[PDB]
Nucleic acid binder design. Structure first.
Ligand SMILES: Nc1ccn([C@H]2C[C@H](O)[C@@H](COP(=O)(O)NP(=O)(O)OP(=O)(O)O)O2)c(=O)n1
Ligand SMILES: [Mg+2]
Ligand SMILES: [Mg+2]
Length: 381
DNA sequence: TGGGGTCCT
DNA sequence: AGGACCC
């Protein structure tokens, strides 16, 4: 009933890919920029005071010698991401994707198959690969410790394979569930791995300063818990279950309370092929229908390129826009003939479709100014 | 004024 | 169609 789970997080992913593209940026402090924001930066820049998700002004101010690379086109990063996911799928068929650079792999069955091959005299030769959380002493007779050590061996093999086959470095965390693996992956960064033995579990769960640092607790839930006087992990462990159920609903309360103890009963789910494609474009303002129509033709073009390559045809189109000052969206199924024609000029009809979806949301007669325009193809089959 | 994704309601 | 979460 006890598992072995590994979590893989790539170091400065966008920056890493940009460095692989042209090695001219290997030692220069590098930051990947999308509009007025630096999503990530090279670790050389991270030394200079540059942080992830800084303003471009705050980045160049704290580090003027910073070199910036535009990263609004995610195509190369996406290619690398799925190469990583496939590589990990080689080890175990079930690999769950989180983000572009995070991956969960269930090593349990693989670890057992490994253990049955070893002999009684060899069970003493098992050694850890990478870091052990909190320098915890290993009990070679504790079977859980052994299985987690094998998990660290498989994790090291995974990272070595990633570097030799894709030229990518990453951090890994081996634990007994998903939450603890993802939490223990980032203990030693960059390009280091850490295994967490059960005794140290509580320590890790209290190393956190605030509760938002837990996956599954976002801005809304954390704001509500701040309003409820919950500011620490122990504050959530000790909170009355009934009151929390009443304030957050039944499901969320049970789940985040179980998370508050580091308990994760979730299994690794084979992510497989993506359930949707989408292209985004933001700006300061857009106040012309023809202005919006051209951007929709652009996003529509890139999406048309992407859908014909997957071989899976989308069955529903969605338009999302954000007005100036929240998001709003209107979708509809794609007609039968244009679905079949994908793979014939399919450009002209789709536009009209989206434009209809556009005119429903915004009255062209009344003035308007749009902040965000995004197109999505979903319901792939 | 980031550019994507997931599932639940 | 919107809302919560993740990177
Ligand atoms: N809000 C976000 C978060 C991440 N990303 C992209 C940029 C990152 O290169 C990539 C991975 O994000 P991340 O793992 O949170 N931090 P990154 O991998 O850049 O460096 P580490 O801090 O993991 O070493 O996703 C984004 O575009 N918008
Ligand atoms: Mg990450
Ligand atoms: Mg990362």
């Amino acid at each position: 009933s006890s598992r072995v789970i590994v979590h893989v997080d790539l170091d400065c992913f966008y920056a890493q890919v940009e460095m692989i593209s042209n090695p001219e940026l290997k030692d220069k402090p590098l930051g990947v920029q999308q509009k007025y924001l630096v999503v990530t930066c090279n670790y050389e820049a991270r030394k200079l005071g540059v942080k992830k998700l800084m303003n471009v002004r705050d980045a160049k101010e704290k580090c003027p010698q910073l070199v910036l690379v535009n990263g609004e086109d995610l195509t190369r990063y996406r290619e690398m991401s799925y190469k990583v996911t496939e590589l990990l799928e080689e080890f175990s068929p079930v690999v769950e994707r989180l983000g572009f650079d995070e991956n969960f792999v269930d090593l349990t069955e693989m670890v057992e198959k490994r253990l049955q091959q070893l002999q009684s005299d060899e069970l003493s030769a098992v050694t850890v690969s990478g870091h052990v959380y909190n320098n915890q002493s290993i009990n070679l007779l504790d079977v859980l410790h052994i299985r987690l050590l094998v998990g660290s061996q498989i994790a090291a093999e995974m990272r070595e394979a990633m570097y030799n086959q894709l030229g990518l470095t990453g951090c890994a965390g081996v634990a007994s569930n998903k939450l603890l693996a993802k939490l223990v992956s980032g203990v030693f960064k960059p390009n280091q791995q850490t295994v967490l033995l059960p005794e140290s579990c509580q320590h890790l769960i209290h190393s956190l300063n605030h509760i938002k640092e837990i996956p599954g607790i976002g801005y809304k839930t954390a704001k509500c818990l701040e309003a409820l006087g919950i500011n620490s992990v122990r504050d959530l462990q000790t909170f009355s279950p009934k009151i929390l159920e009443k304030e957050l609903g039944i499901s969320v309360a049970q789940r985040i309370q179980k998370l508050s103890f580091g308990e994760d009963n979730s299994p690794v789910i084979l992510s497989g092929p993506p359930q949707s494609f989408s292209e985004e474009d933001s700006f300061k303002k857009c106040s012309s229908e023809v202005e919006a129509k051209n951007k929709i033709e652009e996003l529509l073009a890139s999406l048309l390129n992407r859908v014909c390559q997957d071989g899976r045809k989308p069955h529903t189109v969605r338009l999302i826009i954000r007005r100036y000052s929240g998001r709003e969206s209107r979708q509809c199924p794609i007609p039968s003939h244009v679905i079949q024609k994908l793979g014939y000029d399919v450009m002209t009809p789709m536009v009209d479709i989206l434009m209809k979806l556009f005119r429903n949301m915004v009255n062209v007669k009344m003035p308007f100014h749009l902040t965000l325009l995004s197109v999505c193809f979903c319901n792939l089959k």
